[PDB]
Amino acid sequence: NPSKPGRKTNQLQYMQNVVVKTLWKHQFAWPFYQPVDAIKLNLPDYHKIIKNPMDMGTIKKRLENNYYWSASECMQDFNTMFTNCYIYNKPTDDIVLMAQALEKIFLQKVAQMPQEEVEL
Amino acid sequence: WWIIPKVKKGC
């Protein structure tokens, strides 16, 4: 949980208008649009193994509602989303390749992000 | 969508 009320910042606007937008448009992003539905997907022990679920739809909603105080918290949510995927799933699963491809784009956009955070 | 969830997609 954040330690301060959220803000609008140059870095958070970049996460919303560059990072989320570029990831969402790829045809392999769809498994990350919504929380993992472990009932419909019949995923045994998903919530026993994954204690902090996260998805890109939740991240997008948090950005639009100014939930985050800093883009560092948003980047951690993306990291949680990818790490959960690798922890729960099997090496040869389709989902792992899809996460790897999205995570590479995520890191590329983080490398290109403005390095200081200023409130808007 | 999934043929087998997480393992193999159908789309």
Chain A CA closest to residue B6: A95
- Rounded CA-CA distance A25/A8 in Å is 23
- Residues A81, A59: contact at Cβ < 8 Å? yes
- Is the CB of B8 less than 8 angstroms away from the CB of A95? no
* Residue A41 to residue B8, Cβ atoms within 8 A: no
- What distance in Å separates residue A41's CA from the closest CA in chain B? 6
Name every residue whose Cβ is closer than 8 Å to that of residue B4 and which is 6 or more positions away in sequence: none
Distance between CA atoms of residues A45 and A39, nearest Å? 10
Elucidation technique: X-ray
Rounded Cα–Cα distance for residues A88 and A85 (Å)? 6
How near does any CA of chain A get to the CA of B8, in Å?
A: 5
